[PDB]
Structure formats: C-alpha cells, structure tokens
Amino acid sequence: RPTFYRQELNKTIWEVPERYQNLSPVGSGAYGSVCAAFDTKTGLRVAVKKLSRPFQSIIHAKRTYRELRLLKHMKHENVIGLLDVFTPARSLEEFNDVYLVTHLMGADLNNIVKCQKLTDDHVQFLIYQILRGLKYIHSADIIHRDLKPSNLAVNEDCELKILDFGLARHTRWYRAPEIMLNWMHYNQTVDIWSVGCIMAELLTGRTLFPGTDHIDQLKLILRLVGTPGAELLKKISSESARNYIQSLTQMPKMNFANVFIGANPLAVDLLEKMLVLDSDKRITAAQALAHAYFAQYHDPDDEPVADPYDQSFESRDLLIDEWKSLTYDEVISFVPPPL
Numbered sequence: 001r002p003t004f005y006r007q008e009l010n011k012t013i014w015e016v017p018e019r020y021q022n023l024s025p026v027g028s029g030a031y032g033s034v035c036a037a038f039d040t041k042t043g044l045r046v047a048v049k050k051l052s053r054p055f056q057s058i059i060h061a062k063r064t065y066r067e068l069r070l071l072k073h074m075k076h077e078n079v080i081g082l083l084d085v086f087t088p089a090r091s092l093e094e095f096n097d098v099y100l101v102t103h104l105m106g107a108d109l110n111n112i113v114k115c116q117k118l119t120d121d122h123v124q125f126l127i128y129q130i131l132r133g134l135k136y137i138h139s140a141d142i143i144h145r146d147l148k149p150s151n152l153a154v155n156e157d158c159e160l161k162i163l164d165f166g167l168a169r170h171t172r173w174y175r176a177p178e179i180m181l182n183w184m185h186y187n188q189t190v191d192i193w194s195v196g197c198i199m200a201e202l203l204t205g206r207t208l209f210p211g212t213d214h215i216d217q218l219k220l221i222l223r224l225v226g227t228p229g230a231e232l233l234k235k236i237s238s239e240s241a242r243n244y245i246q247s248l249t250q251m252p253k254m255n256f257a258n259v260f261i262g263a264n265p266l267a268v269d270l271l272e273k274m275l276v277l278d279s280d281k282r283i284t285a286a287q288a289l290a291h292a293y294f295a296q297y298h299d300p301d302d303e304p305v306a307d308p309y310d311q312s313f314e315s316r317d318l319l320i321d322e323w324k325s326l327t328y329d330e331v332i333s334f335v336p337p338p339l
C-alpha cells in the first residue's frame with residue numbers, strides 16, 4: 001500500500017500515491033478532471049484522471065465500471081491504455097474515489113489543426129494510426145461512437161492515441177448520418193464516417209460539415225454525398241426517417257475531386273470510400289489500412305486485433321453497491337504493464 005499525499009487543485013481534492021509528482025491541471029476528461037503528473041517510478045510524464053462522483057447513481061457506477069474494464073482491456077500503441085488505477089480507500093466500505101492513469105500526450109488534434117494545415121505525409125501517418133487503433137478496438141466489438149479531433153491525442157514525433165472510445169451511448173460535426181438520425185441499423189463504420197470528416201479537415205484546414213442542429217447537419221452532409229438512393233431507401237425501417245428523406249430537395253452526389261481540389265488523388269479516393277451514406281457500403285478500418293494511400297506505412301503483420309472482450313455486464317441491471325464492488329475487484333486485480 002503506497003503513501004498517499006493530499007492537495008487541492010481547482011476546488012477538488014487529489015489524494016494520490018507519492019510516486020505521482022508535480023500534479024498540474026490539464027482540463028476536463030470523460031466524467032472527471034485530468035492532471036499532468038511525473039511518475040517517479042517509471043520516469044514517465046502521465047495524465048491522472050479523478051472520476052467525478054463515480055458511485056453517485058447506478059448510471060455513474062455502471063460507467064465507472066465500463067471505463068475501467070475498457071481501459072484494462074486495451075493494449076495497443078494507438079489506443080489509450082491503463083498505466084495505473086488507484087483509490088486512497090483501504091476497504092470496499094471506504095471505496096468512493098477512482099483515479100485512472102495513462103500516458104501524458106503532447107497535444108490534441110483539435111489544437112494541431114489550428115496550428116494549422118498538415119502536410120499530406122502528416123495526414124497519411126495520423127489517419128493510418130487512427131485506422132490501426134480502430135481496427136483493434138472494432139475487433140473487440142467496441143465502437144468509439146464519438147470519434148473527433150479532441151479525443152485524438154498526439155506527441156511531437158506524430159505518434160497518435162485514441163481516447164474516450166466505448167463510452168458514448170443513446171460532437172455532431174463528425175457524426176455519421178445514421179447514428180445521429182437512427183435510420184439504419186448502424187455498425188462500427190460509424191467511426192469510419194468520423195475518420196473521413198477528420199481527414200477532410202486535416203487536409204483542407206476547414207470543418208467538413210459544420211452544422212447547427214441535427215437537420216442542418218444532415219442538409220450539409222447530403223449536399224456533399226447526395227440524397228439517399230433507392231437501394232438505401234429500401235434499408236430504412238423508421239417510417240419517420242423515410243418520409244422525411246423523401247420530402248427533402250433531391251441532391252446529387254458531388255465529385256470529391258472537385259471539392260478537395262489540390263489534394264492527393266489517393267486521399268480523395270479514400271474519402272469517397274469513407275464518406276458513403278450506406279453503412280453497409282462504407283470501408284472498414286481493416287480494409288482502409290490496405291488502401292494505396294497508406295503504402296509507406298501499411299504493414300499487415302503489425303496491425304493487430306484485440307483479445308475478445310466480455311461486454312456481458314452491459315446487459316445487466318445491478319444496484320450501486322454491486323457496480324461499486326465489481327469496480328473494486330477490477331481496481332484490486334490490476335496488473336501494471338511489464339518492462
């Protein structure tokens with residue numbers, strides 16, 4: 001059991017083991033606040049997230065469990081993974097705080113694309129790594145659902161990691177038309193739509209579909225990709241969605257070469273494959289990695305899949321204390337990475 005030191009950072013109290021030195025606020029995280037810290041044990045610069053009211057309700061307790069399970073499962077270079085997880089609590093009875101530890105990253109893609117237009121080689125490498133990371137996440141039957149520039153973290157040497165995958169349930173600019181409108185069934189390719197939007201923005205320096213509401217968002221989308229075809233209309237079970245689509249002004253699919261003028265034709269070809277309205281026709285992460293645009297990076301022997309992931313808990317209806325105890329077992333059973 002380590003020695004814990006107490007401090008206050010922006011009205012919140014942090015009780016962390018002594019190895020975590022020079023805690024400095026970095027901003028808001030998914031369901032809590034994040035601090036940059038120096039880990040004396042590894043010499044790594046780390047990001048520490050203290051979850052906010054982790055067991056206040058069934059909803060909080062289940063998502064705390066969900067995030068910890070996800071983080072403990074992910075072991076890939078382009079996917080955020082767990083370096084450590086701790087609680088100052090000595091017993092389950094006392095258990096009320098969860099601190100999660102991962103690598104501290106240099107910047108987010110949101111702040112990089114404002115400093116400013118990336119070269120085609122830089123786009124190739126960053127998009128490659130997103131798709132490599134999504135290939136792995138998707139292989140464990142996990143979907144991001146809210147992939148966007150603010151959850152893509154990158155270092156000075158251009159190494160990228162995906163954060164906040166598997167947490168979103170139920171940013172609009174990067175959202176697939178089907179997951180926003182609940183038309184079609186939807187699959188893991190909802191993240192590929194997001195990749196397309198991010199890639200377009202990295203290449204042009206401009207948001208591809210900067211909508212104001214769900215209706216304006218669809219309008220902007222259909223202006224590029226065209227109104228749904230007869231083959232796609234056949235696949236819509238929602239009578240509301242169908243009536244609406246058929247009511248809208250018919251729009252043809254624009255030629256992406258005439259939109260993304262100046263861009264590498266291989267980037268334009270990939271975008272055409274990622275920005276397909278029909279979720280069944282959209283390119284997958286594994287297929288996109290073999291696209292000629294990634295010729296200098298693609299390595300089919302270094303594009304791993306994940307071990308299977310047990311998501312059965314998602315279907316369970318348990319009490320706060322049950323979710324809390326399950327989280328406590330996951331905290332105690334944690335094994336840090338090897339050297």
Ligand SMILES: CCNC(=O)NCc1ccccc1-c1cc(-c2cnc(NC(C)C)s2)nc(NCCN(C)C)n1
Binds near residue numbers: 101153165
């Ligand atoms: C399972 C998915 N969970 C997950 O990825 N958790 C992330 C996570 C897990 C355990 C410990 C820390 C984090 C965690 C780490 C970090 C950062 C690491 N390096 C950063 N550098 C700055 C300069 C860009 S931010 N940011 C966020 N939230 C950044 C803002 N988001 C988009 C709200 N959460």
